[PDB]
């Protein structure tokens, strides 16, 4: 049926070209003009061009150009958007879509260009201290220092944090990034830990919050 | 080009109340054929593509919600939530589709009117581990608190330091309607140890003065 499958993201090298397929189903491309749509990161949408197969037609936005060579394989109902010697810039996601306005948006697959390797985060618990004489409040913390790609899961105690929780960002720190996590807890003494998930360097750590 | 005018970025919504976003365009999308506006509607929420609500200007989608009304002609147009749900709570552009190349607009977000909350503050100085490896990061948490804006200062025994400092805000609270937010300033283990306070600094709305909070290298 009307479906856009995409990829969901690609890590390619800087000054390198992507191809970024877009297999469509419940219509034929050849009989419409599949679109494509660029969204940069905490930033607006915007358009590329789009592939009008059928009359052969195909218009970009002058702001693409060369970068962008939108083609399309009829017999494998995939659109395609080629990306040409890439920059940062570049990075941001990469919309399919038919925008005479109709909805159909596919999944969109994030492209992050970095000369970085996939490296294994760095886990580091933000105990606090403070003890008053009982009187006090709680609240601790995690940090996830560099690591590619993103992204990486934090939880606490597996799941029985949530509320209190929170879970900023992992801002960039050339090529690698940090995310920090917080939670509350009202005042106890037994164990609190993070737990650190990562999928690409295959790395897990649950740091216990002992506290300091 | 069809330059999409859309203000403001963001605009502050009570729940159950009517909003009422607008946006303006420079050449008409009038067509004067079918008469009907080429402008559509769309709404983005974080990790979702956009979701087409009113096309024709005012002419709603297949399984938009009637509280949702297009309107406009011209070059002037308006999106109009009444009964604010906090479902609505999302980005909104208008695009063209009228002309080549197609133009969207910036966007106009909702944030729900919470009450303000004052941040509470906390600093954590470097873990054990943070050092072997060379480095110090001292993170500080601002976490609930309202309206959005804070200024957060850092600062090595008294004095200023405005490097080496990574500031993850966060989005609007679901349950709370409320902002956190997470300043870090890394430092090398010697740069570190060459010192002794370090303070967190939070100037927020809440107060009529800053809100402090500093460690000291020196204290268990």
Redesign the interface.
């Given at each position: 049926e009307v479906a856009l499958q995409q990829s969901g993201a690609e890590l390619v090298k800087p000054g390198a070209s992507v191809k970024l397929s877009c297999a469509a189903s419940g219509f034929t491309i050849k009989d419409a003009y599949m679109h494509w749509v660029k969204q940069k990161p905490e930033q607006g949408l915007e358009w590329i061009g789009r592939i009008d197969s059928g009359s052969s037609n195909t218009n970009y936005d002058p702001t693409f150009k060369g970068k962008a060579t939108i083609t399309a394989d009829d017999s494998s109902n995939t659109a395609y958007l080629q990306m040409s010697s890439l920059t940062s810039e570049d990075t941001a996601v990469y919309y399919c879509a038919r925008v005479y306005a109709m909805d159909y948006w596919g999944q969109g697959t994030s492209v992050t260009v970095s000369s970085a390797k996939t490296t294994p985060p760095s886990v580091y618990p933000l105990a606090p201290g403070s003890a008053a004489q009982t009187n006090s409040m709680v609240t601790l913390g995690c940090l996830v220092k560099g690591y590619f790609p993103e992204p990486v899961t934090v939880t606490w105690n597996s799941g029985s944090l949530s509320s209190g929780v929170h879970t900023f960002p992992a801002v960039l720190q050339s090529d690698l990034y940090t995310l920090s996590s917080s939670v509350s807890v009202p005042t106890s003494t037994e164990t609190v830990t993070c737990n650190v998930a990562h999928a690409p360097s295959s790395t897990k750590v649950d740091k216990k919050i002992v506290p300091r | 080009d069809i330059v999409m005018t859309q203000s403001p970025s963001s605009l502050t919504v009570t729940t159950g109340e009517k909003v009422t976003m607008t946006c303006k365009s420079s050449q008409s999308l009038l067509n004067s054929g079918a008469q009907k506006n080429?402008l559509?509607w769309?709404q983005?929420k974080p990790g979702q593509?956009?979701?087409?609500l009113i096309?024709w200007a005012s002419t709603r989608?297949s399984g938009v919600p009637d509280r949702f009304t297009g309107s406009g002609s011209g070059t002037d147009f308006t999106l109009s939530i009444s009964g604010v749900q906090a479902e609505d709570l999302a980005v909104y552009?208008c695009?063209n589709?009228y002309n080549?190349?197609?133009?969207?607009?910036?966007?106009t977000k909702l944030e729900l009117k919470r009450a303000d909350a004052a941040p509470?503050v906390?600093i954590?100085?470097?873990?054990?581990?943070?050092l072997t490896?060379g480095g110090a990061?001292v993170?500080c948490?601002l976490?609930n608190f309202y309206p959005k804006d804070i200024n957060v200062k850092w600062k090595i025994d008294g004095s200023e330091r405005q490097n080496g400092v990574?500031?993850?805000?966060?989005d609007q609270d679901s349950?709370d309607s409320t902002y956190?937010?997470?300043s870090?300033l890394?430092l090398t283990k010697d740069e570190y140890e060459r010192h002794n306070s370090y303070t967190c600094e939070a100037t927020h709305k809440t107060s009529t003065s800053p809100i402090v909070k500093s460690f000291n290298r020196n204290?268990?």
């Open positions: - | 080429y559509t769309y983005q593509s956009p979701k087409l096309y989608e552009y695009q589709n080549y190349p197609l133009t969207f607009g910036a966007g509470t906390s954590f100085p470097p873990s054990s581990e943070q490896s990061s993170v948490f976490n990574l500031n993850s805000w966060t349950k956190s937010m997470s870090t890394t204290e268990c």
